[PDB]
């Protein structure tokens, strides 16, 4: 049957990682060049969190983004009255001169008085990546260098080719958002190098990441602004080009979509490279009440599952995201695809499904970890189609990704009774009106990829062990090479 079944998530996720207890907050991926793998520290979130002492740094290890190994608690919160009562995002770097990993992080004071610093950067080190010792005498207060007392967080650490260590910190100078730069030769003495970049208008870029890839410098960052809540980027051929993008609010977007790389279900993305590939890790939020259509009024729930994506540099230096090769390989078992139900103008024809304005086709039940591929050809580039999940033959409501070629964007929406728009993901519509679609699922977390242009993370409770559906809202489509694979 293709009746709606009441699926639920396992405590843990193995690919779009979540530990057995708690959720994955802001990650901090780092390629450990001694062990030759990625150590992804992340802020461990719990439901609920302590009031003052929350968000310790746990870690997980992976070579490839598909299989993870948990490392447990690495840097504990401080005491209730310490400056690092709560811990916020930071940045690891290995120092070969003393054979110590250094993790800089945000210490978050509980109930800071007016004079006290809410947010201060602090550090721990480790010889193996297992035992971490806090440096109880190191504090980097923005205040000291003319920056903000309470917004001063998310230290990012990188070494240029000159060998100099740099640290970028999300802050404000008299109201306006600035990314602050500090430099050091030895990771211990730090000097202020002024402002690296301005933040546009009244925006606030959390979790900044700066890296070079081919012949381009990039800034990745997550936008705090309530209406955005998406991972964005800028680019420049030189480091001075990069900085110039936001200078005086110059708005030099890297592409036709403001550099928005995904939508509001992928936040806090930061990157790391193994020499071959550069991946990005963010989190896919939970939803209140496990309700796919409750996406928050101002903001999504903070933290959820870890989501690895792969950076695709195009030849104009523009970036999009696709799947990690190792996640694609994980799906070994082919599954029969078969129509369980039709509606309106819908024709099957050997192994090709043709749908017109208002038509629907529902396929057989998915499994728990799914890969879904298919090619869609539209009539025009004003056509609209839908990829729907948790859609049983008895479901009055369900959740679809709408691809609206007229509006040059995909949307996540609730369909049926109580339909509603939720949010969207601008991408480049194919000229040839062909859409090579690929979707990867671990339980309730999935990413949808089209034509190496779209990368759309979504939280979809109960997509597992439930049917899925294609439809056509406008014009006409033709669906081809439909496959489903599992593990
Ligand atoms: O009241 C505590 C309670 O709130 C949550 C759920 O939102 O956590 C946020 C809480 O975590 C901290 C300490 O680890 O670190 C946050 C790290 O995450 C980043 C990027 O996501 O930003 C914070 C995130 O929080 C919001 C919450 O709505 O922060 C709003 C808050 O930010 C300030 O600017 C000061 O933090 C205030 O102006 C404002 O009232 C959201 O808009 C942001 O995206 C990184 O930037 C950061 O390192 C704290 O900074 C934060 O308060 C629960 O998990 C927890 O139980
Ligand atoms: O209400 C937000 C909703 O808009 C939708 C619904 O249609 O839009 C978000 C969507 O819109 C863009 C389109 O570019 O921009 C959003 C802008 O909102 C803000 C906040 O007000 O813009 C103000 C506006 O003023 C300029 C000056 O010519 O600037 C002055 C500027 O300088 C400062 O003084 C500080 O230096 C600031 O305080 C002032 O704001 C204009 O250029 C500027 O555009 C800006 O932060 C954004 O411009 C998209 O970027 C965004 O995705 C819906 O999605 C939202 O819910
Ligand atoms: O009421 C939602 C309904 O609005 C539309 C109207 O065409 O789109 C979204 C609208 O919001 C932005 O994302 C940013 O302001 C823009 O991309 C766009 O102008 C529909 O698509 C949706 O179905």
Author numbering: 17 to 503
Provide text from the study.
Glycan uptake across the bacterial outer membrane (OM) of these bacteria is mediated by SusCD protein complexes, comprising a membrane-embedded barrel and a lipoprotein lid, that is thought to open and close to facilitate substrate binding and transport. Here we show that for both the levan and dextran utilisation systems of Bacteroides thetaiotaomicron, the additional OM components assemble on the core SusCD transporter, forming stable glycan utilising machines which we term ‘utilisomes’. Transport-competent FOS are generated from levan by a surface-exposed lipoprotein, a GH32-family levan endo-glycanase (GHlev), while an SGBP (SGBPlev) is thought to recruit levan at the cell surface. Single particle cryogenic electron microscopy (cryoEM) structures in the absence and presence of substrate reveal concerted conformational changes that demonstrate the mechanism of substrate capture, and rationalise the role of each component in the utilisome.
The density is compatible with ~12 β2,6-linked fructose units in an extended conformation, with a putative β2,1 decoration on Frc-7. Levan binding at this tethering site is also seen in GHlev in the absence of bridging interactions with SGBPlev and in crystal structures of the inactive levanase solved in the presence of FOS of DP ~7-8 (ED Fig. 8). Indeed, secondary binding sites are relatively common in endo-acting GH enzymes, where they may enhance substrate processivity. No ligand was observed at the secondary site in a GHlev structure complexed to a 4 unit FOS (PDB ID 6R3U28), suggesting the affinity for short FOS is low. Single substitution of aromatic residues (to alanine) near the GHlev active site (Y70A and W318A) decreased affinity for levan 25-30 fold, while equivalent substitutions at the tethering site FOS4 had a 6-fold decrease in affinity (W217A) or no effect (F243A and Y437A). These results suggest the active site (FOS3) is responsible for most of the affinity of GHlev for levan. However, numerous weak interactions within the extensive secondary site (FOS4) including polar residues, may result in a substantial overall affinity and specificity.
